[PDB]
Amino acid sequence: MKNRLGTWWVAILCMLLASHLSTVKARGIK
């Protein structure tokens, strides 16, 4: 209800993508 929210979620989208754009990286085959 607009109080604590804000970026808390923004972090999620930055967290769920993190790995995706971190360890998920693999330009060397596989």
GROMACS .gro file of N, CA and C in nm:
model
   90
    1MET      N    1   0.082  -0.120   0.000
    1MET     CA    2   0.000   0.000   0.000
    1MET      C    3   0.087   0.126   0.000
    2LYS      N    4   0.190   0.123  -0.083
    2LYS     CA    5   0.280   0.236  -0.094
    2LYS      C    6   0.327   0.277   0.046
    3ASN      N    7   0.431   0.208   0.092
    3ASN     CA    8   0.487   0.236   0.223
    3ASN      C    9   0.634   0.194   0.226
    4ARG      N   10   0.655   0.064   0.214
    4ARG     CA   11   0.789   0.009   0.215
    4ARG      C   12   0.834  -0.025   0.073
    5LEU      N   13   0.736  -0.054  -0.011
    5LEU     CA   14   0.763  -0.089  -0.150
    5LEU      C   15   0.847   0.023  -0.214
    6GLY      N   16   0.862   0.012  -0.345
    6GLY     CA   17   0.939   0.111  -0.419
    6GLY      C   18   1.045   0.044  -0.506
    7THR      N   19   1.160   0.019  -0.445
    7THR     CA   20   1.270  -0.044  -0.515
    7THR      C   21   1.285  -0.190  -0.470
    8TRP      N   22   1.227  -0.219  -0.355
    8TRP     CA   23   1.233  -0.354  -0.300
    8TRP      C   24   1.206  -0.452  -0.414
    9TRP      N   25   1.113  -0.414  -0.500
    9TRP     CA   26   1.077  -0.498  -0.613
    9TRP      C   27   1.180  -0.475  -0.724
   10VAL      N   28   1.214  -0.348  -0.744
   10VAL     CA   29   1.311  -0.312  -0.846
   10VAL      C   30   1.436  -0.399  -0.831
   11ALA      N   31   1.461  -0.440  -0.707
   11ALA     CA   32   1.576  -0.523  -0.678
   11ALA      C   33   1.550  -0.665  -0.727
   12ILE      N   34   1.424  -0.705  -0.718
   12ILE     CA   35   1.384  -0.838  -0.761
   12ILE      C   36   1.411  -0.853  -0.911
   13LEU      N   37   1.366  -0.754  -0.986
   13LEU     CA   38   1.385  -0.755  -1.131
   13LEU      C   39   1.535  -0.744  -1.162
   14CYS      N   40   1.609  -0.694  -1.064
   14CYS     CA   41   1.752  -0.678  -1.080
   14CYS      C   42   1.821  -0.799  -1.018
   15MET      N   43   1.742  -0.879  -0.947
   15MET     CA   44   1.794  -0.998  -0.883
   15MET      C   45   1.763  -1.123  -0.966
   16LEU      N   46   1.643  -1.125  -1.022
   16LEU     CA   47   1.601  -1.237  -1.104
   16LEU      C   48   1.678  -1.235  -1.236
   17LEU      N   49   1.724  -1.117  -1.272
   17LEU     CA   50   1.799  -1.100  -1.395
   17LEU      C   51   1.949  -1.113  -1.366
   18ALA      N   52   1.985  -1.077  -1.244
   18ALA     CA   53   2.124  -1.085  -1.202
   18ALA      C   54   2.187  -1.212  -1.258
   19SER      N   55   2.159  -1.323  -1.191
   19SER     CA   56   2.212  -1.452  -1.233
   19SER      C   57   2.201  -1.466  -1.385
   20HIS      N   58   2.081  -1.440  -1.435
   20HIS     CA   59   2.056  -1.449  -1.577
   20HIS      C   60   2.163  -1.371  -1.654
   21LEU      N   61   2.201  -1.258  -1.597
   21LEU     CA   62   2.303  -1.174  -1.658
   21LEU      C   63   2.430  -1.177  -1.573
   22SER      N   64   2.459  -1.295  -1.520
   22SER     CA   65   2.576  -1.313  -1.437
   22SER      C   66   2.636  -1.452  -1.460
   23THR      N   67   2.589  -1.547  -1.380
   23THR     CA   68   2.637  -1.684  -1.391
   23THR      C   69   2.576  -1.752  -1.514
   24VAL      N   70   2.462  -1.700  -1.555
   24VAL     CA   71   2.393  -1.755  -1.671
   24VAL      C   72   2.475  -1.728  -1.797
   25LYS      N   73   2.568  -1.635  -1.784
   25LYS     CA   74   2.654  -1.599  -1.895
   25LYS      C   75   2.742  -1.719  -1.932
   26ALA      N   76   2.759  -1.738  -2.062
   26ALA     CA   77   2.840  -1.848  -2.112
   26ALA      C   78   2.856  -1.834  -2.264
   27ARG      N   79   2.944  -1.744  -2.303
   27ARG     CA   80   2.969  -1.720  -2.444
   27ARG      C   81   3.056  -1.832  -2.502
   28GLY      N   82   3.116  -1.908  -2.411
   28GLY     CA   83   3.202  -2.018  -2.452
   28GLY      C   84   3.125  -2.150  -2.455
   29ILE      N   85   3.047  -2.167  -2.561
   29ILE     CA   86   2.968  -2.287  -2.577
   29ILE      C   87   2.880  -2.307  -2.454
   30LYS      N   88   2.787  -2.401  -2.465
   30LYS     CA   89   2.696  -2.430  -2.356
   30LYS      C   90   2.656  -2.300  -2.287
   0.00000   0.00000   0.00000
